[PDB]
Amino acid sequence: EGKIINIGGTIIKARLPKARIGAFYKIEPSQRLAEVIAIDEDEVFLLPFEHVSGMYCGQWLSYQGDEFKIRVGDALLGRLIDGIGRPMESNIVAPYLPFERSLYAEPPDPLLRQVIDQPFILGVRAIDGLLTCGIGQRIGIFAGSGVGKSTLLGMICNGASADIIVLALIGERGREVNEFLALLPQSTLSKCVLVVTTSDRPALERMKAAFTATTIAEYFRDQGKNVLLMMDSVTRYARAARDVGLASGEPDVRGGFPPSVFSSLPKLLERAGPAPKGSITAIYTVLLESDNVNDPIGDEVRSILDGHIVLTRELAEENHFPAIDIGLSASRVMHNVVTSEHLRAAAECKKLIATYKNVELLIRIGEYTMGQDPEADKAIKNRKLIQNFIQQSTKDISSYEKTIESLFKVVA
Amino acid sequence: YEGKIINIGGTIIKARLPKARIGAFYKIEPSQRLAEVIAIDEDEVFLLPFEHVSGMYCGQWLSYQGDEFKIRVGDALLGRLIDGIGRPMESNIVAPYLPFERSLYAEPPDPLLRQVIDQPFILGVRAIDGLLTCGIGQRIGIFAGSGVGKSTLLGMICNGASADIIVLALIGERGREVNEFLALLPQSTLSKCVLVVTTSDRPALERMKAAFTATTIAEYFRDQGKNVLLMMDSVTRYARAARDVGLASGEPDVRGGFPPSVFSSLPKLLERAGPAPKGSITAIYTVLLESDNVNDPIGDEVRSILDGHIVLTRELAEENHFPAIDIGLSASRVMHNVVTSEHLRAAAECKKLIATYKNVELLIRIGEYTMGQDPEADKAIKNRKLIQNFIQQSTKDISSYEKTIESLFKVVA
Amino acid sequence: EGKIINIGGTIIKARLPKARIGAFYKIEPSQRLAEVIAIDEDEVFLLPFEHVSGMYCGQWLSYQGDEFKIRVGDALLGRLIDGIGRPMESNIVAPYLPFERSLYAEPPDPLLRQVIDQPFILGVRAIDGLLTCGIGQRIGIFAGSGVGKSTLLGMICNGASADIIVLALIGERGREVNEFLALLPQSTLSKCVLVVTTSDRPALERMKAAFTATTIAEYFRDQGKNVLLMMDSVTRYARAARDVGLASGEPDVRGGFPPSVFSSLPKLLERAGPAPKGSITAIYTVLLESDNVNDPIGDEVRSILDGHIVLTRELAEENHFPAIDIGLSASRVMHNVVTSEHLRAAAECKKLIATYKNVELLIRIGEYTMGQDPEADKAIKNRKLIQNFIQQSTKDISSYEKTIESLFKVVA
Amino acid sequence: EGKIINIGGTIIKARLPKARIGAFYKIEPSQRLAEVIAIDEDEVFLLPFEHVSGMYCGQWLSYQGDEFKIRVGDALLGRLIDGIGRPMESNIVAPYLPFERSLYAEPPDPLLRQVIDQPFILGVRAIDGLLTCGIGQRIGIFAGSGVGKSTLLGMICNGASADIIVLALIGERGREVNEFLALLPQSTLSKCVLVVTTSDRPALERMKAAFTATTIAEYFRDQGKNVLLMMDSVTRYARAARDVGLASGEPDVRGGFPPSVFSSLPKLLERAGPAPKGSITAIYTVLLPIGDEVRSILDGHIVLTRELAEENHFPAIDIGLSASRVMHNVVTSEHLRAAAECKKLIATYKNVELLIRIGEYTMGQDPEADKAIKNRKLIQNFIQQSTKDISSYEKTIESLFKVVA
Numbered sequence A, C: 001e002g003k004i005i006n007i008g009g010t011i012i013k014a015r016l017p018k019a020r021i022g023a024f025y026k027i028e029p030s031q032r033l034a035e036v037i038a039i040d041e042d043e044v045f046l047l048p049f050e051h052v053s054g055m056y057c058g059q060w061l062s063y064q065g066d067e068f069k070i071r072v073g074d075a076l077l078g079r080l081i082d083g084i085g086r087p088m089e090s091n092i093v094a095p096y097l098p099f100e101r102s103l104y105a106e107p108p109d110p111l112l113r114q115v116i117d118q119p120f121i122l123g124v125r126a127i128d129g130l131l132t133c134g135i136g137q138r139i140g141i142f143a144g145s146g147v148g149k150s151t152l153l154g155m156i157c158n159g160a161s162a163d164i165i166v167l168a169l170i171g172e173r174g175r176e177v178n179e180f181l182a183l184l185p186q187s188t189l190s191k192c193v194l195v196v197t198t199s200d201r202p203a204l205e206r207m208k209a210a211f212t213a214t215t216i217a218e219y220f221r222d223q224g225k226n227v228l229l230m231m232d233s234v235t236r237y238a239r240a241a242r243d244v245g246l247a248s249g250e251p252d253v254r255g256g257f258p259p260s261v262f263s264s265l266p267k268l269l270e271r272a273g274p275a276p277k278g279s280i281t282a283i284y285t286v287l288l289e290s291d292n293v294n295d296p297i298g299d300e301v302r303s304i305l306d307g308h309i310v311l312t313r314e315l316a317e318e319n320h321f322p323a324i325d326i327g328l329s330a331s332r333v334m335h336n337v338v339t340s341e342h343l344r345a346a347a348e349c350k351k352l353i354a355t356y357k358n359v360e361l362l363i364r365i366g367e368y369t370m371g372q373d374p375e376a377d378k379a380i381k382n383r384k385l386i387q388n389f390i391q392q393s394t395k396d397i398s399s400y401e402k403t404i405e406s407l408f409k410v411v412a
Numbered sequence B: 001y002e003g004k005i006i007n008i009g010g011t012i013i014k015a016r017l018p019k020a021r022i023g024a025f026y027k028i029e030p031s032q033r034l035a036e037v038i039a040i041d042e043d044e045v046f047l048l049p050f051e052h053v054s055g056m057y058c059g060q061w062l063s064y065q066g067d068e069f070k071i072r073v074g075d076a077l078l079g080r081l082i083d084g085i086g087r088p089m090e091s092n093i094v095a096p097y098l099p100f101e102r103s104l105y106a107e108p109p110d111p112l113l114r115q116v117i118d119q120p121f122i123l124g125v126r127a128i129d130g131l132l133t134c135g136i137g138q139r140i141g142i143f144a145g146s147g148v149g150k151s152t153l154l155g156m157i158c159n160g161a162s163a164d165i166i167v168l169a170l171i172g173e174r175g176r177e178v179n180e181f182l183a184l185l186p187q188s189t190l191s192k193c194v195l196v197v198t199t200s201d202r203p204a205l206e207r208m209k210a211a212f213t214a215t216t217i218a219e220y221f222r223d224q225g226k227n228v229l230l231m232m233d234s235v236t237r238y239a240r241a242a243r244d245v246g247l248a249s250g251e252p253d254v255r256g257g258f259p260p261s262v263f264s265s266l267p268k269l270l271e272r273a274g275p276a277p278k279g280s281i282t283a284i285y286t287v288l289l290e291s292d293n294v295n296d297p298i299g300d301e302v303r304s305i306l307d308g309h310i311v312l313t314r315e316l317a318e319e320n321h322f323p324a325i326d327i328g329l330s331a332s333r334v335m336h337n338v339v340t341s342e343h344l345r346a347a348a349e350c351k352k353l354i355a356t357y358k359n360v361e362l363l364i365r366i367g368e369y370t371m372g373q374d375p376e377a378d379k380a381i382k383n384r385k386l387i388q389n390f391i392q393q394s395t396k397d398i399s400s401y402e403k404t405i406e407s408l409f410k411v412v413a
Numbered sequence D: 001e002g003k004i005i006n007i008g009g010t011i012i013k014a015r016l017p018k019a020r021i022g023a024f025y026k027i028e029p030s031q032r033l034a035e036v037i038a039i040d041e042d043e044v045f046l047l048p049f050e051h052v053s054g055m056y057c058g059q060w061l062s063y064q065g066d067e068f069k070i071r072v073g074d075a076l077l078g079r080l081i082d083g084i085g086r087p088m089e090s091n092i093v094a095p096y097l098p099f100e101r102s103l104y105a106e107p108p109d110p111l112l113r114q115v116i117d118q119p120f121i122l123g124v125r126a127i128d129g130l131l132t133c134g135i136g137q138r139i140g141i142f143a144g145s146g147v148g149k150s151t152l153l154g155m156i157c158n159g160a161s162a163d164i165i166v167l168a169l170i171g172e173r174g175r176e177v178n179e180f181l182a183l184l185p186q187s188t189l190s191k192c193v194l195v196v197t198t199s200d201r202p203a204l205e206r207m208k209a210a211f212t213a214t215t216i217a218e219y220f221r222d223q224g225k226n227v228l229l230m231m232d233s234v235t236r237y238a239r240a241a242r243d244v245g246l247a248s249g250e251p252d253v254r255g256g257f258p259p260s261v262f263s264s265l266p267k268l269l270e271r272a273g274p275a276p277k278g279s280i281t282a283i284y285t286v287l288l289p290i291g292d293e294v295r296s297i298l299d300g301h302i303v304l305t306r307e308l309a310e311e312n313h314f315p316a317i318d319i320g321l322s323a324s325r326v327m328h329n330v331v332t333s334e335h336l337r338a339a340a341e342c343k344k345l346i347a348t349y350k351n352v353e354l355l356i357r358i359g360e361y362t363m364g365q366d367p368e369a370d371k372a373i374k375n376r377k378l379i380q381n382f383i384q385q386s387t388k389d390i391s392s393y394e395k396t397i398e399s400l401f402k403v404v405a
């Protein structure tokens, strides 16, 4: 037991002699749980699973657990789970999950990871013709606010070729859990797990949803089947962890973020990828703070992740959707996957896009003798062909062969 | 009786009173004024008074009133003005019989019961119905600088739109304006409208809780099963009041001022107004920006919370392009569901025509544009004065939803 | 009765047990004053009315009242007032004032404001034809340093006919008291109260002088008079409040300023407007920290007041006086005041000003051929008529009728 | 023995006297270990390597010594190793490691720099014909992303004139270590000792991997051997030491980096040069606020541009703006002038390509460009070879001699 002596907005400070970090306590009069996040030799910083309704001084605590585990198993497809691990829907009968796992595992050994050599057919024509994703790659989608990170996941998840899909909705609107279900048919809903926590929810449900989704992805990986994982705004995880750690006596470092965010983010983000048996392939939506690249939580996620898709709102103004900026974006694993003519044609049309992005100024001003600079002469004649290759509709999914045949047409 | 105020100054008082709940409020015993407990330490607690802090002294006794501040709603407050605390503003009246006492803080609907919105909510403005398009159940925001177009466009929307109940929250704004909003809305609209008025002179608490009062009244008239239009002018006044309360209570400073309480308590308010099992709330929140940059702390946060954003630019108000909404920089996140394919395709073509002229505009002014060497630049010029009569609109004009479609089809050709 | 325990440079603090906040005290041996602003269980922060040089630890504080109230009356007309209510001019007898008023009163109730619909002529043609002032409108004049703020208030001191002129000169040059007494005739000076504190005076006396001007204007409003209040550089009040609020231990929320200067600027600017009995029409001069309009106090006072008249340095260097930028200027009540043909004539004139600033570099370099655009030729032919309608010398005043007839002549 | 007072996220505070700065402490039951950054009078601010969850008030600290030193031997060759010297896998038992030495040593002063000779044949025809390095020349490769740096480093681990080949992989990705170890043969992998540490690994050992690699390579320097020392992405060492310095508490100076990384990085890489008892040739990579700081601190920098790898020209090297400061000390004047006329033979081809485009291309005089356009094929077969075309030093110079002809 122990006494509660301090009630802030986010965190609780209590008196517990020799309490363990992670060891969760429930509150005796009112059934609500809390998890210890710091020690101050008698003053323990606990973090409650819920809201702070009435929290008087000297309210008691009681010991419940050594660390917080979730309950997983095969009887989990087609369900909706919150960040804690509880079933969110109440229309369905209560499941049977045989196994329990801790949320903090350790990544696979880097000597035993495989080599990515088979493409991940994705659906979008730019992210298959120009930036091919491999099965086992961890790509990321960097954009501002309302630039189209959520649509692009709809375009991917609609036409995705995975054996099993784990979709995490961290810290985001509850208006849209039904809109991700509205574009998932039952053929790709009978094998999908949605782990959803809303921005209404408290700080550590919103902080631990990423770990719950990664633990579930690791379970269906350790059965032996490759699995897609999609986190929507891992920046909502990073800002939940910032709010948790910063209100516990831990200083600012670079953007308001404590050291523990930069210490706990490359352990979440690294336990995907290849494995001795199976492979998680993951897609991390990252919400940039402003429209800059001097962002302390978008720059390191660009640094420790192979493949960054930079969406630009300076292309979303011209109604160019999806707003993929091919100049600022790259995929590290397309020189290990696709054929040599595919690499050559993709680099050819990236040259054509980059040449048209500075030749048209001397088109509008009348200084253009067609014939002297050959590359620009092929970058304007193939303008509308490239533009109808790059931007596509939300409901237009296309197989990998059609993307590469239109690629060979638009280069030739 | 119970505790003693030991610290007076700024926005919050601090008192020594033990076994205090959080959120419970307390009457200052010789003074009839009362205060909410916002943060608890071992024996000293942070309180937030409802009124001015002047006149207080150390050891002033602090009696107990209740465990939670609740407001009092009923059906008998249509056509009537409400304060931020919950009291009625006007004193000419006989006070209503408001029977149902609702708590101020409540929970959003279940995310699995909020259905997909697919019915257009007709406002009346041609740009925001033709190019962008609202839906019955979304929550849209109007982002602008200081004195650009927010309250003029919200008056146009309140003039043109129709709903069963209209809750209009004039929080944090000048007192001159409560008569202009009562002037430009008709008698039939005043038969179904509740104003929640908090002027900018009022304390941090009234200016902080008037938004939750308006959202609670909209939830009450939603639970009866009516399509209620919520309109909240300057939700950033809530954000500034939560800032100085949370900083006075001793919190850090992330994203330019603004404690973690602000960014963690905006979604606990803005997620409460949408589709629902019974009824729906169509919320319209105006946002004031600390410069003309849209990428504010609060501007970017509220843009990443809401369902659609209408960004108004000062550089279009310098040219009398009213309403000053910037079509390339604004967007509506539900118009692909609420309208057919011809309108969506024609709106896409018109938005691209506007962006094409914005690229062509500067090198016409300094005089270096050449006609003929680009087919779609000239198409963005040959139509331009035709599209502007669709994109800019007088204040005393409402436009039907079928005239908007036929004007857009004539513009786009 | 209590003793001072430190002196900080701006504020002092003392050991007063159980003191009221807002109450003021005499520093007992040496005859000065201070007032309580914050309490720390026996240690009160005090803001002295004078300079702090000479004090020492253990210096007593006798009690004098619970609130610093000024002595107001009807015999203030025609005489000059120190920043805290005292008379200045020692050449004549002390006036007799009957009543006491505190400096902190409430605004009129918002249901009793009676939306403003009568014009208030100023004498300047740009703030008659193209902007228009209502009786009860509070207006701001936003500019940089030495751009023409005081010159324009001197223009509209002898042009605006109001019943009582209460002019405040807070935080400005001591040299100017005579110059604003050399622009007012005796038919104006017999009804003009002139409250003035200069840049020398202590931080309390520059903080608490705008409240003195508003309290005198409210005493003359409650008799039924149409008061014209006008303040010089209200940002001098904002900077005095910044200095005291940072000395008293408040954070730095935006651009240098505490939150208490942002929360106490509306409850000074909201008292001057339309009322049930009488009215105060006010004109606040605002100095900006650069020539940017997006200063923090510039932005906040723009979001409080009912109209902003932006003077730019560029037009002053162009010798375009008065330097009003018509694009950045707005009057929030012009449409409730002027007639509709006046309104559309004003909108057409502002359209012509913007169209000339579009086509000016096109005609100067030599690409504009006479006849292409059917509005730019209107603007070019009416340029000089617009320009000598906009410009005005200091000693020229225009009426309302001649201004609108010249507006109709110039715009068509 | 030393109890732990409290835990602050990443900074532990213990109550123990007679501590040292840099004294690696040790959890006694859990066999986790922690390192000291600052002391109070009686308390000590220290920070751990491993995880934090599980630590309560009163855990004991084995003091375990005074500074952490790695067990170095001749039996490290062909064996994986972590960033603090411990072995990677338990698949092979650890061999005999009879000698120990600290990570920190005193360098000679920069005023006593030496002349350099004994040309360092390194494998790729471009620099080993044109930018020819020596035994003491430490080289900094500047290469962005999508440019093929790993294949270049792997093909210059092959055919390098090094008896011992120490390579440090620092902070990188768990797939890239296998993708790099695949393209090294057993003829090389029986000769390397190679430090790997991934981004999951803590920042403290992700900066001690640099000192571990330099310490092992300087022990193998002392046995009368020449040794090559690679370090991929010095910028990852910079961000690791930045996290260690800012978690310890330091005001940033330029960008977000503390001054302690600018204290350590010269002290990291102006040591390990041409020692007379056997020497150590360094190859450091830096991706494209510290880039000028690196190319002004070591001699002879290679740049790689992915614009040059837009074509199928691997290695993605540009000769026109990559330099090697010490060739005149190393190679003769004849080969130096031949390589110089080749550099200015290539460097006028893009100075003549832009006038191929507009219709004014004339003859009559193109004295650096007319011989280039006719003899371009031997150029682009000379500075363009495969992934496993290791060229001898005697045939690179002859091939360059009929390239200049």
Ligand SMILES: Nc1ncnc2c1ncn2[C@@H]1O[C@H](COP(=O)(O)OP(=O)(O)O)[C@@H](O)[C@H]1O
Binding pocket: A143, A144, A145, A146, A147, A148, A149, A150, A151, A152, A321, A322, A323, A392, A393, A394, B304, B331, B332, B333, B334
């Ligand atoms: N591929 C697309 N096609 C059409 N519209 C798009 C596309 N991508 C984004 N948009 C527009 O941008 C708006 C917001 O994008 P969203 O995905 O909601 O942003 P975020 O994921 O960053 O919250 C949507 O209303 C949508 O109409």
Ligand SMILES: Nc1ncnc2c1ncn2[C@@H]1O[C@H](COP(=O)(O)OP(=O)(O)O)[C@@H](O)[C@H]1O
Binding pocket: B144, B145, B146, B147, B148, B149, B150, B151, B152, B153, B322, B323, B324, B393, B394, B395, C303, C330, C331, C332, C333
């Ligand atoms: N659609 C419009 N038609 C006419 N005038 C407008 C329009 N929009 C803005 N304005 C002018 O700009 C001024 C400021 O707009 P306002 O709505 O008061 O800004 P705020 O957003 O701060 O409330 C108004 O007085 C108005 O006359």
Ligand SMILES: Nc1ncnc2c1ncn2[C@@H]1O[C@H](COP(=O)(O)OP(=O)(O)O)[C@@H](O)[C@H]1O
Binding pocket: C143, C144, C145, C146, C147, C148, C149, C150, C151, C152, C321, C322, C323, C392, C393, C394
């Ligand atoms: N209408 C005008 N005619 C002539 N000079 C002017 C006019 N308006 C401004 N100026 C110039 O600007 C100077 C300083 O302006 P002032 O009003 O004193 O600046 P501030 O805004 O700093 O008080 C005037 O003395 C004059 O030189």
Ligand SMILES: [Mg+2]
Binding pocket: A149, A150, A172, A173, A232, A233
């Ligand atoms: Mg989203």
Ligand SMILES: [Mg+2]
Binding pocket: B150, B151, B173, B233
């Ligand atoms: Mg407004």
Ligand SMILES: [Mg+2]
Binding pocket: C149, C150, C151, C172, C232
């Ligand atoms: Mg002045």
